Amino acid sequence: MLIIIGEKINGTIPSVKKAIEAKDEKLIRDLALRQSEAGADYIDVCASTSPELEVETLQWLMDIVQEATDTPLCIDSPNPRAIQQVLLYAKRPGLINSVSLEGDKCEVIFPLIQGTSWQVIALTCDNSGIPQDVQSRVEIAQALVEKAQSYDIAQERIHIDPLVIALSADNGALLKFAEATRQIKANYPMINVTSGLSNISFGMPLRKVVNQNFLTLAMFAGMDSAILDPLNRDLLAALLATEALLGRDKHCRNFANAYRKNKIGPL
Amino acid sequence: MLIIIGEKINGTIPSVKKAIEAKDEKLIRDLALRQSEAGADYIDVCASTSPELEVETLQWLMDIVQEATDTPLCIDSPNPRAIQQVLLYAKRPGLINSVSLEGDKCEVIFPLIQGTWQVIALTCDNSGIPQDVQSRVEIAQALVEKAQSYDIAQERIHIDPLVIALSADNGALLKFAEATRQIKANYPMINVTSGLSNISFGMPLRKVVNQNFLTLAMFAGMDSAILDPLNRDLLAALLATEALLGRDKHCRNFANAYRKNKIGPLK
Ligand SMILES: Nc1nc2c(c(=O)[nH]1)N[C@@H](CNc1ccc(C(=O)N[C@@H](CCC(=O)O)C(=O)O)cc1)CN2
Ligand SMILES: Nc1nc2c(c(=O)[nH]1)N[C@@H](CNc1ccc(C(=O)N[C@@H](CCC(=O)O)C(=O)O)cc1)CN2
Numbered sequence: 001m002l003i004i005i006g007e008k009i010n011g012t013i014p015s016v017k018k019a020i021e022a023k024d025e026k027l028i029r030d031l032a033l034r035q036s037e038a039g040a041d042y043i044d045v046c047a048s049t050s051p052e053l054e055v056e057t058l059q060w061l062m063d064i065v066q067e068a069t070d071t072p073l074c075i076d077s078p079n080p081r082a083i084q085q086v087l088l089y090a091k092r093p094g095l096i097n098s099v100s101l102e103g104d105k106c107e108v109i110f111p112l113i114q115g116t117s118w119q120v121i122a123l124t125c126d127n128s129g130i131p132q133d134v135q136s137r138v139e140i141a142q143a144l145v146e147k148a149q150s151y152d153i154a155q156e157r158i159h160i161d162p163l164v165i166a167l168s169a170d171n172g173a174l175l176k177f178a179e180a181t182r183q184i185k186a187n188y189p190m191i192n193v194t195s196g197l198s199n200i201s202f203g204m205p206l207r208k209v210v211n212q213n214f215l216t217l218a219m220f221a222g223m224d225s226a227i228l229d230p231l232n233r234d235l236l237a238a239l240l241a242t243e244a245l246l247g248r249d250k251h252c253r254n255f256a257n258a259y260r261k262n263k264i265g266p267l
Numbered sequence: 268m269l270i271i272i273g274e275k276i277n278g279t280i281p282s283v284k285k286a287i288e289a290k291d292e293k294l295i296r297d298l299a300l301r302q303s304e305a306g307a308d309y310i311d312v313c314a315s316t317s318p319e320l321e322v323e324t325l326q327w328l329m330d331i332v333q334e335a336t337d338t339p340l341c342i343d344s345p346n347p348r349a350i351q352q353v354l355l356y357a358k359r360p361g362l363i364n365s366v367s368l369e370g371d372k373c374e375v376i377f378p379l380i381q382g383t384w385q386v387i388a389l390t391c392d393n394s395g396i397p398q399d400v401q402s403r404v405e406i407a408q409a410l411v412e413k414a415q416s417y418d419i420a421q422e423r424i425h426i427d428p429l430v431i432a433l434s435a436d437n438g439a440l441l442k443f444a445e446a447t448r449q450i451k452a453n454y455p456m457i458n459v460t461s462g463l464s465n466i467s468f469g470m471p472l473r474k475v476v477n478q479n480f481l482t483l484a485m486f487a488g489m490d491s492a493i494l495d496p497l498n499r500d501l502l503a504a505l506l507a508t509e510a511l512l513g514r515d516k517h518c519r520n521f522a523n524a525y526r527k528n529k530i531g532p533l534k
Pocket of ligand 2: 275462463465501
């Protein structure tokens with residue numbers, strides 16, 4: 001069954017930016033609870049503030065989220081020092097978003113989780129940036145798994161993100177995401193492949209439609225977890241329909257339950 | 268690449284049945300036109316009336332469609348004798364819906380199109396519609412073999428694996444994809460086709476399920492489908508899925524359609 005990382009608590013979204021500035025606890029609790037109620041397995045928290053305010057902002061977001069829901073945190077920062085300084089504010093282990101072959105991300109994050117039950121998203125990039133092909137992404141995923149192994153981190157705890165690019169930039173963006181996913185899972189059947197949805201549609205109209213269909217496909221290609229907006233009813237219906245279509249919803253009960261509970265459908 | 272057989276002109280849709288009984292040509296003319304304008308490659312025509320009226324009703328439908336559009340006909344009848352009696356009324360080669368190993372379907376239809384027409388061939392026989400993969404694959408081989416008897420090339424045939432309701436078999440889509448893989452493997456030049464609505468029988472939000480089934484079936488290798496191209500949401504899925512599969516250079520059909528208002532909010 002697809003693992004859902006709810007994306008909505010970010011500093012990039014203007015309403016969330018404004019709620020952080022205001023210390024608007026109600027808005028953050030409501031995003032937390034409703035993402036959980038829609039089926040999120042992790043609640044992403046991303047401060048998106050300046051460097052010097054990031055750690056305090058993450059701490060505030062984690063405190064408020066955990067008041068509202070027991071669903072575990074996905075700590076989203078591009079600064080491993082920030083992640084280090086907030087890990088202890090989590091009440092239970094969750095997901096770290098993320099590491100990569102860039103700079104010292106692995107050597108800061110992996111000692112911090114080596115021994116505990118934290119999981120980790122690992123992006124397929126390194127110091128030269130986004131890879132320019134499938135093969136490069138696959139080799140980077142291998143290098144990530146080996147590094148993780150040297151700190152005793154099992155492949156099961158790892159969500160490889162092959163950083164899908166925009167379909168407007170490369171019309172093979174999905175055919176290349178599906179190929180990297182097949183090769184990575186072929187080399188590591190216990191590993192998890194993850195993606196965000198939004199990058200795929202950057203540069204196109206009706207981005208929600210494009211995101212949905214990419215999800216519908218990415219699931220069929222083997223994607224195990226995804227960062228997405230589970231408050232998007234249409235997206236949630238497509239998600240659950242795709243779960244039933246891939247033979248993961250016994251007697252289509254979850255889909256039927258979601259409609260009867262008015263989780264999906266009009267409206 | 269997905270070849271669209273517009274399903275609208277049927278004798279089972281209450282409104283079209285009333286148009287046949289009322290001889291309301293305008294309605295049929297506008298379904299032919301709108302389905303062509305939406306991109307249909309073939310216009311399915313199905314009488315769905317008392318047997319002894321079927322030939323005359325098929326002829327009436329074929330004349331009105333033809334007068335309106337050059338988009339070729341898909342003659343839809345469960346009675347091969349009816350097909351035989353109306354074939355000469357088509358102004359140009361189209362598609363015949365359908366043959367199967369049931370009764371004398373092949374023995375009637377194949378000599379009819381030998382030396383000429385494309386054909387949908389269902390994977391069912393005198394015992395009914397098998398639900399398993401292996402039986403359907405074997406039935407398809409038998410059909411391709413019998414079609415070869417009349418010099419009908421693989422390229423002219425659209426194999427329909429008759430996908431059943433997901434609520435009746437949760438593996439229906441998985442089985443579709445596997446049948447498709449095997450059939451194509453054996454016959455790389457053939458077409459695989461499906462309708463979209465059977466899959467969602469017995470589930471709520473049928474249109475949602477149908478649209479995700481379409482996306483999945485396209486990635487699985489479906490070549491043609493009988494569907495409603497007047498459905499704004501289904502067309503937006505279809506076109507987003509064409510772009511995601513690498514088939515819409517620069518995403519130009521998707522953008523063009525959006526610009527023309529074809530897909531997206533009706534503003
Ligand atoms: N590891 C990893 N982490 C990530 C991303 C990834 O790729 N991989 N990409 C981002 C995923 N997070 C978001 C958060 C919000 C939006 C966003 O745009 N939200 C709108 C859009 C609404 C919608 O489409 O439903 C909103 O209004 O809430 C997109 C990605 C950042 N974190
Ligand atoms: N070879 C083959 N032929 C077939 C089918 C198939 O499987 N395979 N199945 C049927 C396909 N034709 C239709 C026509 C109309 C509808 C239908 O239900 N239409 C609604 C709703 C349209 C919509 O959902 O957008 C309407 O109001 O027009 C469903 C299947 C019969 N012909």
